[model samples]
Target: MATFQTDADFLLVGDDTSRYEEVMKTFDTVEAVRKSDLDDRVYMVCLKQGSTFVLNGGIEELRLLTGDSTLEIQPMIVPTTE
Candidate 1:
Protein backbone atom coordinates (compact mmCIF):
# COMPACT_ATOMS: atom_id res chain seq x y z
CA MET A 1 0.00 0.00 0.00
CA ALA A 2 1.06 3.58 -0.64
CA THR A 3 0.76 6.65 1.56
CA PHE A 4 -1.49 9.38 0.23
CA GLN A 5 -3.14 12.66 1.27
CA THR A 6 -6.30 14.25 -0.02
CA ASP A 7 -7.41 17.86 0.47
CA ALA A 8 -10.38 19.94 -0.64
CA ASP A 9 -11.65 23.53 -0.42
CA PHE A 10 -15.16 24.89 -0.89
CA LEU A 11 -16.34 28.40 -1.64
CA LEU A 12 -18.42 30.14 1.00
CA VAL A 13 -21.96 31.04 0.04
CA GLY A 14 -22.77 34.02 2.23
CA ASP A 15 -21.44 36.01 5.18
CA ASP A 16 -18.08 35.29 6.79
CA THR A 17 -19.66 33.43 9.67
CA SER A 18 -21.75 31.30 7.39
CA ARG A 19 -18.83 30.67 5.09
CA TYR A 20 -16.59 29.70 7.95
CA GLU A 21 -19.23 27.42 9.34
CA GLU A 22 -19.79 25.84 5.95
CA VAL A 23 -16.07 25.36 5.41
CA MET A 24 -15.64 23.76 8.80
CA LYS A 25 -18.70 21.59 8.35
CA THR A 26 -17.64 20.60 4.88
CA PHE A 27 -14.15 19.66 5.99
CA ASP A 28 -15.00 18.24 9.40
CA THR A 29 -14.50 14.68 8.18
CA VAL A 30 -12.87 12.93 5.26
CA GLU A 31 -16.02 10.95 4.52
CA ALA A 32 -18.04 14.16 4.55
CA VAL A 33 -15.67 15.74 2.05
CA ARG A 34 -15.75 12.67 -0.14
CA LYS A 35 -19.55 12.71 -0.10
CA SER A 36 -20.23 16.44 -0.40
CA ASP A 37 -21.90 18.06 -3.41
CA LEU A 38 -20.59 21.66 -3.45
CA ASP A 39 -22.99 22.97 -6.08
CA ASP A 40 -22.12 26.24 -7.88
CA ARG A 41 -19.31 27.41 -5.64
CA VAL A 42 -15.79 26.34 -6.48
CA TYR A 43 -14.50 23.20 -4.85
CA MET A 44 -10.96 21.94 -5.30
CA VAL A 45 -9.33 18.72 -4.19
CA CYS A 46 -5.99 16.95 -4.53
CA LEU A 47 -4.62 13.52 -3.79
CA LYS A 48 -0.94 12.75 -3.57
CA GLN A 49 0.81 9.41 -3.35
CA GLY A 50 4.21 7.84 -3.92
CA SER A 51 3.23 6.64 -7.38
CA THR A 52 2.00 9.06 -10.00
CA PHE A 53 -0.07 6.33 -11.60
CA VAL A 54 -1.79 5.59 -8.33
CA LEU A 55 -2.45 9.24 -7.72
CA ASN A 56 -3.94 9.66 -11.17
CA GLY A 57 -5.97 6.52 -10.76
CA GLY A 58 -7.30 7.65 -7.40
CA ILE A 59 -8.27 10.97 -8.88
CA GLU A 60 -10.13 9.22 -11.68
CA GLU A 61 -11.97 7.09 -9.16
CA LEU A 62 -12.91 10.18 -7.20
CA ARG A 63 -14.32 11.82 -10.31
CA LEU A 64 -16.30 8.74 -11.19
CA LEU A 65 -17.70 8.52 -7.68
CA THR A 66 -18.57 12.19 -7.81
CA GLY A 67 -20.53 12.01 -11.07
CA ASP A 68 -17.76 13.00 -13.47
CA SER A 69 -17.45 16.52 -12.08
CA THR A 70 -14.53 18.68 -13.18
CA LEU A 71 -11.60 19.19 -10.84
CA GLU A 72 -8.43 21.05 -11.69
CA ILE A 73 -5.15 19.48 -10.72
CA GLN A 74 -1.86 21.30 -10.89
CA PRO A 75 1.25 19.18 -10.52
CA MET A 76 4.65 20.55 -9.55
CA ILE A 77 8.05 18.91 -9.35
CA VAL A 78 10.74 19.94 -6.91
CA PRO A 79 14.32 18.73 -6.40
CA THR A 80 15.70 17.13 -3.27
CA THR A 81 19.39 16.74 -2.40
CA GLU A 82 21.41 15.10 0.31
Candidate 2:
Protein backbone atom coordinates (compact mmCIF):
# COMPACT_ATOMS: atom_id res chain seq x y z
CA MET A 1 0.00 0.00 0.00
CA ALA A 2 1.18 3.48 -0.73
CA THR A 3 0.61 6.21 1.81
CA PHE A 4 -0.42 9.57 0.45
CA GLN A 5 -1.65 12.91 1.68
CA THR A 6 -4.79 12.92 -0.42
CA ASP A 7 -6.88 15.24 1.66
CA ALA A 8 -6.81 18.94 0.81
CA ASP A 9 -8.79 22.17 1.00
CA PHE A 10 -8.95 25.33 -1.06
CA LEU A 11 -8.60 28.98 -0.22
CA LEU A 12 -9.86 31.66 -2.55
CA VAL A 13 -7.87 34.81 -1.99
CA GLY A 14 -9.02 37.99 -3.61
CA ASP A 15 -6.92 41.04 -4.41
CA ASP A 16 -8.69 43.32 -1.98
CA THR A 17 -6.75 42.13 1.01
CA SER A 18 -3.84 44.05 2.46
CA ARG A 19 -2.29 40.87 3.84
CA TYR A 20 -2.01 39.15 0.48
CA GLU A 21 1.77 39.03 0.47
CA GLU A 22 1.88 37.74 4.00
CA VAL A 23 -0.71 35.08 3.18
CA MET A 24 1.47 33.63 0.43
CA LYS A 25 4.31 33.44 2.89
CA THR A 26 2.20 31.90 5.64
CA PHE A 27 0.89 28.95 3.65
CA ASP A 28 3.03 26.26 2.02
CA THR A 29 0.99 25.63 -1.12
CA VAL A 30 -0.52 28.46 -3.15
CA GLU A 31 -1.41 29.07 -6.81
CA ALA A 32 -2.76 32.12 -8.61
CA VAL A 33 -5.54 31.93 -11.22
CA ARG A 34 -7.56 34.34 -13.34
CA LYS A 35 -10.82 32.62 -14.20
CA SER A 36 -13.27 34.01 -16.70
CA ASP A 37 -16.06 34.00 -14.12
CA LEU A 38 -14.13 36.19 -11.75
CA ASP A 39 -13.26 39.82 -12.35
CA ASP A 40 -10.07 39.72 -10.32
CA ARG A 41 -7.27 37.25 -9.97
CA VAL A 42 -7.70 34.89 -7.06
CA TYR A 43 -5.09 32.83 -5.32
CA MET A 44 -5.76 29.20 -4.50
CA VAL A 45 -4.13 27.86 -1.37
CA CYS A 46 -4.16 24.11 -1.05
CA LEU A 47 -4.16 22.86 2.49
CA LYS A 48 -2.92 19.32 2.47
CA GLN A 49 -3.95 17.35 5.53
CA GLY A 50 -6.88 19.69 5.50
CA SER A 51 -9.45 17.42 7.15
CA THR A 52 -7.28 17.21 10.24
CA PHE A 53 -6.89 20.96 10.38
CA VAL A 54 -10.59 21.58 9.95
CA LEU A 55 -11.52 18.98 12.49
CA ASN A 56 -9.54 20.89 15.07
CA GLY A 57 -10.86 24.39 14.38
CA GLY A 58 -12.48 24.91 11.02
CA ILE A 59 -12.07 28.06 8.89
CA GLU A 60 -12.06 30.44 11.87
CA GLU A 61 -8.74 29.02 12.92
CA LEU A 62 -7.24 30.02 9.59
CA ARG A 63 -8.95 33.39 9.70
CA LEU A 64 -7.28 34.15 13.00
CA LEU A 65 -4.00 32.76 11.82
CA THR A 66 -4.02 34.69 8.56
CA GLY A 67 -5.74 37.78 10.02
CA ASP A 68 -7.57 38.50 6.82
CA SER A 69 -11.17 38.06 5.65
CA THR A 70 -10.44 39.04 2.11
CA LEU A 71 -10.00 35.35 1.40
CA GLU A 72 -12.49 32.50 1.44
CA ILE A 73 -11.75 28.96 2.53
CA GLN A 74 -13.80 25.89 1.64
CA PRO A 75 -13.61 22.23 0.79
CA MET A 76 -13.27 22.50 -2.95
CA ILE A 77 -13.05 19.44 -5.15
CA VAL A 78 -9.46 18.45 -5.54
CA PRO A 79 -8.34 17.20 -8.91
CA THR A 80 -6.61 13.91 -9.39
CA THR A 81 -3.84 14.14 -11.93
CA GLU A 82 -2.07 10.95 -12.55
Candidate 3:
Protein backbone atom coordinates (compact mmCIF):
# COMPACT_ATOMS: atom_id res chain seq x y z
CA MET A 1 0.00 0.00 0.00
CA ALA A 2 1.10 3.55 -0.62
CA THR A 3 2.20 5.76 2.25
CA PHE A 4 -0.61 8.25 2.50
CA GLN A 5 -2.27 10.30 5.16
CA THR A 6 -5.04 8.88 7.30
CA ASP A 7 -8.26 10.18 5.78
CA ALA A 8 -10.35 8.61 8.49
CA ASP A 9 -10.02 7.50 12.08
CA PHE A 10 -8.42 4.08 12.51
CA LEU A 11 -10.11 1.94 15.11
CA LEU A 12 -7.93 -0.67 16.76
CA VAL A 13 -10.55 -3.19 17.82
CA GLY A 14 -9.36 -5.34 20.67
CA ASP A 15 -10.56 -7.12 23.76
CA ASP A 16 -8.67 -5.10 26.32
CA THR A 17 -7.90 -1.41 25.87
CA SER A 18 -5.15 -1.88 28.41
CA ARG A 19 -3.15 -3.83 25.83
CA TYR A 20 -3.04 -0.84 23.58
CA GLU A 21 -2.66 1.31 26.64
CA GLU A 22 0.50 -0.61 27.50
CA VAL A 23 1.97 0.05 24.08
CA MET A 24 0.72 3.61 24.19
CA LYS A 25 1.86 3.87 27.76
CA THR A 26 5.30 2.80 26.62
CA PHE A 27 5.13 4.98 23.50
CA ASP A 28 3.48 7.97 25.21
CA THR A 29 0.06 8.28 23.54
CA VAL A 30 -2.90 9.11 25.75
CA GLU A 31 -5.57 6.49 26.32
CA ALA A 32 -8.92 7.22 24.70
CA VAL A 33 -11.76 4.72 24.16
CA ARG A 34 -14.26 2.91 26.27
CA LYS A 35 -17.70 1.20 26.13
CA SER A 36 -17.27 0.86 22.41
CA ASP A 37 -16.80 -2.89 21.97
CA LEU A 38 -19.32 -4.63 24.11
CA ASP A 39 -17.12 -6.28 26.75
CA ASP A 40 -13.96 -5.32 24.91
CA ARG A 41 -12.54 -1.84 24.75
CA VAL A 42 -11.80 -1.09 21.12
CA TYR A 43 -9.17 1.62 20.78
CA MET A 44 -9.46 4.40 18.26
CA VAL A 45 -6.09 6.13 17.99
CA CYS A 46 -5.05 8.86 15.62
CA LEU A 47 -1.71 8.51 13.78
CA LYS A 48 -1.22 12.16 12.94
CA GLN A 49 -2.59 12.40 9.36
CA GLY A 50 0.74 12.66 7.47
CA SER A 51 3.13 10.85 9.71
CA THR A 52 6.22 9.14 8.33
CA PHE A 53 4.81 5.69 9.03
CA VAL A 54 3.28 3.94 6.04
CA LEU A 55 -0.01 2.04 6.08
CA ASN A 56 1.58 -1.32 5.34
CA GLY A 57 4.49 -0.92 7.71
CA GLY A 58 2.33 0.86 10.25
CA ILE A 59 -0.07 -2.07 10.51
CA GLU A 60 2.78 -4.54 10.65
CA GLU A 61 4.60 -2.47 13.22
CA LEU A 62 1.48 -2.26 15.35
CA ARG A 63 1.08 -6.02 15.14
CA LEU A 64 4.60 -6.59 16.34
CA LEU A 65 4.48 -3.72 18.76
CA THR A 66 1.37 -4.80 20.59
CA GLY A 67 1.48 -8.46 19.65
CA ASP A 68 -2.01 -7.99 18.23
CA SER A 69 -3.61 -7.43 14.85
CA THR A 70 -6.83 -5.68 13.80
CA LEU A 71 -5.99 -2.39 12.22
CA GLU A 72 -9.51 -2.10 10.96
CA ILE A 73 -7.14 -0.57 8.42
CA GLN A 74 -10.17 1.46 7.54
CA PRO A 75 -11.04 -1.50 5.33
CA MET A 76 -13.33 -4.20 6.75
CA ILE A 77 -12.46 -2.83 10.05
CA VAL A 78 -7.65 -8.59 22.06
CA PRO A 79 -8.18 -9.41 25.63
CA THR A 80 -6.04 -9.58 28.75
CA THR A 81 -5.69 -9.95 32.53
CA GLU A 82 -3.86 -8.42 35.52
Provide the TM-score for each candidate, comma-separated. 0.27, 0.41, 0.46
lDDT of 1 by residue, 26-80 (tens): 3233222222264443332222322121233444443343334353333323339
Candidate 1 weakest lDDT stretch, 10 residues = 9-18
Task: Tell me the tens digit of each residue's lDDT in model 3 across 1-82.
Answer: 4333354345565546456756644432333333355435555655434432244555566566667665333421333676
lDDT for 56 in candidate 2 is: 46
RMSD of each: 11.1, 7.9, 8.8
Q: How displaced is residue 36 in candidate 1, in Å?
A: 13
TM-score ranking, best first: 3, 2, 1
Clashing residue pairs in candidate 2 (N, C-alpha, C atoms within 3 angstroms): none
Candidate 1: residue pairs that collide: none
Instruction: List the candidate numbers ranked by lDDT, top first.
Output: 3, 2, 1
Q: Identify the candidate with maximal TM-score.
A: 3
Deviation from native of the Cα of residue 80 in model 3, angstroms = 33
Per-candidate local distance difference test: 0.32, 0.47, 0.48
Question: Which has the higher TM-score value, candidate number 2 or candidate number 3?
Answer: 3
Kindly report which residue stretches of model 2 are placed more than 4 angstroms away from their true locations once superposed.
1-6, 13-15, 29-37, 46-55, 77-82
Off by over 4 Å in 3: 1-8, 24-41, 46-56, 70-72, 75-82
Error of 3 at 5 (Å): 4.1
Cα-lDDT of candidate 1 = 0.32
